[PDB]
C-alpha cells in the first residue's frame, strides 16, 4: 500500500492530530490485512515486532466471533501503552472481564448480565433524563465554554453511578477516581497515576459489596452479589473489578460519542435540523458509528489461523481497527455520509458480534439519546468557537476540549 515507511496505525502521535482516514482507506483498497511492523523499542509495550492491521468489517466480525482462536487474555485488548510499560502492568488487565477468555469470561459475563437487562437499564431512564436536562440547561446559561467538560462528561458518569446506586455525596470522589483511570500518553495528563485511583475505587466498591450482602435491596448490586439458582455471584473482589472495569469502559467511550456526535452535527447542519425535528431512534447508532470512540482493540491468535487468505501465526497480534471497519464501502452505502436515519446500521463501534460485544450498548444509546434530546431543547443553535483538541492515545479516539458558543450569537473573535 501507499503508506510512508515506518507508518504505525497505533502511533499516538497520529491521533493527537487526526484520525488516519486516508491511510485506512488505502489499506482497505490495497492490503486489507497488512503487517504493521514496529521498530525495536517502539511496540507500545509489545515486543513482538508488529501486528496484523485488520481494516475490513467482515474480518473484524470473523475475529470477534472466533474467540476460541483469537484471545483477549493472552496480551489483553489494548494495542498501545507507553513503549517502556512493564509486562506486569499489561497483565494486570486480566483481572477485568474485558481481558478474560472462556470459560472464566463466560461465567462472569453471565453474572454481570444481571446489571444490563432491559429492566435494569430502563430503571435509569428518568433520573438520567432529568440530569441530561439539568446539564444542558446549565451549559446554555454559561453562554459559551468547553463542550466536553460542560455537556459530554457528566451524563456517562451519572449512568455508572446510577447503575451502581452510588450515594449522591460519594459521586464527586467516584468521578474523580474514574477520570484518572483511562490511561493515555497525553502531556496534559502526564501527572495523573491511574494505579492509586484504581486501588481507591476497588476498595470503595468492595465495601459496597460487603454492605449490600448484609442489607440486600431490589437493585443491581444486590443481584450481582447474591447467588442465583446455580450458586453463581460476584465475590467482593470480583465486584470491585467490575466497578473498575466500568469506570473505564463506560466513561470516555460514551463521552466521546457525545462530543464527536455534536461535532458531526456542527459539520452537517442538515442532520442537526433533521435531528431536532424528528429525534429519530436510529440517531444513536449513527453517532456511535461516526464517533467510533474505541479506534481499535486487539486479540492474539492461540493457533495458526488463515483469515481472508492471510496466514496468522500462533502468538501473533491482530488489531481490529473499528475506525476502518465502520467506513467499509462493501458493507455500508455511502459510509462517508453522516446519516442519522441509517437503517440497518451494522457498525462495529460496540465491537463485532461475539463473546465480548459491548454489554453496555443499550445504556450507552440511552445516554446518547437523552443528552442530545437535552441539547436540542436547550442549545438548538449552538456553534463551535475553535477546533477540537484531540487526545494523544493509540487506541482511544478522544476529544479533550472543544470550545463552543451555546447561543450561536457570539460573533467571530479575531
Ligand atoms: C458509545 C459508548 C461505548 C462504546 C463505543 C463502547 C465500546 C465497547 C467495545 C468496542 C467493547 C469491546 C467489544 C469487543 O471486544 O467485541 C466494549 C466492551 C465492554 N463495554 Fe462498552 N462501549 C460504550 C459504552 C459502554 C457503557 C456505557 C458501559 C457500561 C456502563 C460499557 C461496558 C462495557 C463492558 C463491561 C465491556 C466488556 C464486555 C466483555 O468483555 O464481555 N460500555 N465496549
From Swiss-Prot:
Reactions it catalyzes: cholest-4-en-3-one + 6 reduced [2Fe-2S]-[ferredoxin] + 3 O2 + 5 H(+) = (25S)-3-oxocholest-4-en-26-oate + 6 oxidized [2Fe-2S]-[ferredoxin] + 4 H2O; (25R)-3-oxocholest-4-en-26-ol + 2 reduced [2Fe-2S]-[ferredoxin] + O2 + 2 H(+) = (25R)-3-oxocholest-4-en-26-al + 2 oxidized [2Fe-2S]-[ferredoxin] + 2 H2O; (25R)-3-oxocholest-4-en-26-al + 2 reduced [2Fe-2S]-[ferredoxin] + O2 + H(+) = (25R)-3-oxocholest-4-en-26-oate + 2 oxidized [2Fe-2S]-[ferredoxin] + H2O; cholest-4-en-3-one + 2 reduced [2Fe-2S]-[ferredoxin] + O2 + 2 H(+) = (25S)-3-oxocholest-4-en-26-ol + 2 oxidized [2Fe-2S]-[ferredoxin] + H2O
A UniProt-annotated Pfam family: p450
Cofactor(s) essential for the protein: heme
Any one of the GO BP annotations: biological process involved in interaction with host
Gene3D superfamilies (UniProt xref): Cytochrome P450
Keywords: Cholesterol metabolism, Heme, Iron, Lipid degradation, Lipid metabolism, Metal-binding, Monooxygenase, NAD, Oxidoreductase, Steroid metabolism, Sterol metabolism, Virulence
PANTHER family associated with the record: BIOTIN BIOSYNTHESIS CYTOCHROME P450, P450, PUTATIVE (EUROFUNG)-RELATED
Protein name per the record: Steroid C26-monooxygenase
Source species taxonomy: Bacteria, Bacillati, Actinomycetota, Actinomycetes, Mycobacteriales
